[PDB]
Symmetry: D2
Subunit: 268 residues, 4 copies
């Protein structure tokens, strides 16, 4: 029963009950899929959040920057799901970029060390995580990551935009690799979703002469979207993810599926 029924899927990126990856896992569980979650430093905290999901799932630690963690993932996962078992899905919902390369800080003022860190976590980790779990996946599986259309320049997104441009390109390579094991790799470009990381800027954390820019940006989205767009509700994005983790899109790979309500296909 369910869309992902019987599939064992790895979800990551969770940190709050408001982050997209949390809703993905919740929908994946509601669709009878069995999970394995990976989290960052505040494991003690992430533990609490996951203790809200409709069902229990082992929670492993995963700093994408720790090449040592990566060297143990496949094993640990093998423990989580059990011998004689393989993964059918891998979801990469991880992003990082110092405020030096996003918010209000000028584009030319982000030092490389900060940018390189963001790209390492936002772009590179997609390839290495795919390098870690590829070997324990069943042919016919789906790896999928989050994206935010970097097609055209926009205010404040600055370097996180460059990282995303570099994520799509990497996604196309991971796919010719993944395709060897019969696995599909795709990205999902979502519109903006009022998550916690931004839940603070909502009141003016970045100020007026900027906190207004991002604002007119989001409104433009529902404005442009033929079917509208509520940014305070991730579900539409999560269902799209689930669709990609299922078996009803087994001919699409190395692609980008836009879950933005058609905004990117309309100018005004």
């Amino acid at each position: 029963t369910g869309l992902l029924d019987g599939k064992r899927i790895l979800v990551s990126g969770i940190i709050t009950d408001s982050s997209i990856a949390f809703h993905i896992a919740r929908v994946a569980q509601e669709q009878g899929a069995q999970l394995v979650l990976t989290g960052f430093d505040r494991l003690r905290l992430i533990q609490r959040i996951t203790d809200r999901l409709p069902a229990k799932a082992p929670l492993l630690e995963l700093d994408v920057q720790n090449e040592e963690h990566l060297a143990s993932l496949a094993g640990r996962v093998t423990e989580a799901i059990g011998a004689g078992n393989k993964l059918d899905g891998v979801v990469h919902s991880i992003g990082f970029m110092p405020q030096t390369g996003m918010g209000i800080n000028p584009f030319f003022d982000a030092p490389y060390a900060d940018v390189s860190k963001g790209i390492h976590i936002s772009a590179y980790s997609y390839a290495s995580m795919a390098k870690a779990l590829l070997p324990i996946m069943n042919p016919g599986g789906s790896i999928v990551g989050m994206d935010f259309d970097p097609s055209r320049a926009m205010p404040a997104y600055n370097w996180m935009t460059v990282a995303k441009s570099a994520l799509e390109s990497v996604n196309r390579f991971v796919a010719r690799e993944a395709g060897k094991y019969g696995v599909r790799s795709n990205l999902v470009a979502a519109g903006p979703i009022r998550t916690l990381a931004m839940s603070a800027i909502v009141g003016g954390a970045l100020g007026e002469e900027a906190g207004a820019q991002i604002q007119l940006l989001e409104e433009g989205w529902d404005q442009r979207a033929p079917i509208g767009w509520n940014m305070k509700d991730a579900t539409p994005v999560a269902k799209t993810v689930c669709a990609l983790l299922s078996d009803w899109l087994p001919a699409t790979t190395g692609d980008i599926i836009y879950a933005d309500g058609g905004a990117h296909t309309q100018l005004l």
Copy 2:
């Protein structure tokens, strides 16, 4: 059980059991959706082909060039689906181009009358159907067409390629009109499927020359595709359509989904 369980969907484009619509209709029904099929002219002859379907679905006549037909369309679907009842999806699997604008004929040598009719049936009927059927579709329902990625020139496809460009363009506007009803409009860029009216080409009826040209595009498609491409299995495509018909991609319109084995994302 079923991905489209309880969805009343219209499928057009069927002529032979080889045609893609037949496989879209098939997978659609194995997943519990109620259908309505439309045929062009040799009506009494396609019943023999839709009689080889899982379930019995009424067949209405629909010649997209005939304005009379279009106008009577909606009333005719009701007479079939049920008073007050609506459609959840409509599939446009209609493509036509005189050999004078496709195959072996030179590009500059196609009369405009032949091109006009190829576009009229290939691009414009998409806006026509949607115009007729929009008023009797459910919110959250969806429309979907068949595409063949024309982002690049290629031998033989010629004016059909230009017809598809317009389709992608026409699709973006249909979504805008479809939004005022909460309906989705998307296209599926299929890979090359050896259909009846296509397997002959390689058979030699195109000549030595062109018969080798076409083979190169195919043989080189499965080569580009990371998870390969079986040119004679419309299932991966039919399954992608059904997916776009479900509620699992509720946030994407005026867009193109590639069920081409990832072959458009690789240069080699």
Copy 3:
């Protein structure tokens, strides 16, 4: 002396002293190129306008819909420039779309006969004109036409948008043909330029509930353009055209060169 010095170029589309093609020809002449202009019905009128250019150029008649005119062009041109002479450039600045398929009239209400007419003149004529003049061009030559980015749907442009989508695709085919004679074919996407055809709507010819839409559309352009954008000045577009007709872009073909001040590369 000049950029196009010595080149014999064919310019078309002129109708007023405000239309883009007029400014193209003016800049082409200012750059020491010798012209041949083709015009539509009001030849008596177009005559006056051209009698403003910095120099005299024969003015031939050319209805792109008259297959008979097309069958005589190469000859007539041969007369204009003289035996032993060939064309080095061809500029297609021609566009048409009934008000039934552009302005305020809904997208679903444009009948095919009107659309087909627009596409015939906006899309198809590019191929047939290239079919007419290709044979009298010198290898190393450039054919170029006007475009308005049809990448994403927009209000009011409706069917003229579909025609343009179909122009870019045709441009890619004309190029593999043109490439046989060593000729390059490219399109130039310009931002909006307050020409006469729209000089009327400026005051409210289309009304408020629409004449305001197109307005916020144009302002968005200068807003988005990193280098600004004055719509009441064609020159920037004309210089771009000249650049394409010269010999400093002999490796680019079947392309689209955007002369919009970078607006299409910026979201907000």
Copy 4:
């Protein structure tokens, strides 16, 4: 006489007389522009190569990874060009990637440190230069980088491909900052030019395998290109750059111009 007559332009990226920058510098000078060249480390060794240039142009040292250099850049160009005098254009012909992220090494097998440096030198230095040189450039002046179309995965190019994606993305933002000065920022997607550090590859130093892989991409490029492609003539490219440096494309920024013989616009 000259397309860039009276334009003071900076050209970087020269190491051998084979390198593309040398040909960009050459054609630039034959067209009357005054130049400033920057070299990386074996300085005293490239003077021998820039001494084979039409005219004597000062050479400054510029290691894009060195912050000290960057900071002293602008002051150093003045010491060369003249007090109160400015630059009209800046050419970025800089690309680098450890063999561990390009050629024969597997894709998942490239350490991040090697990728970080390839991006730092391939993508980020573009924003760096522009940041240093922007304050001393003339309005209407322009900046231009070298690109290699990464819209699709391909064998061997691997992480250099991901580095170029970021370049195209970085370029869109540079134009936004460059607009506040009336400067243009564009990239030239060159076709494959057999450079010194590239002709060896086919020579066998890549091995039998990869040495055939690379050949296929090349041999199949001139095949796709409608006006063909001479992989060992950087002139068509150099001439496209100079064009982007002139005032004949004053309305295009944050964009990519393909001097690839039209090879990206054909599927076969």
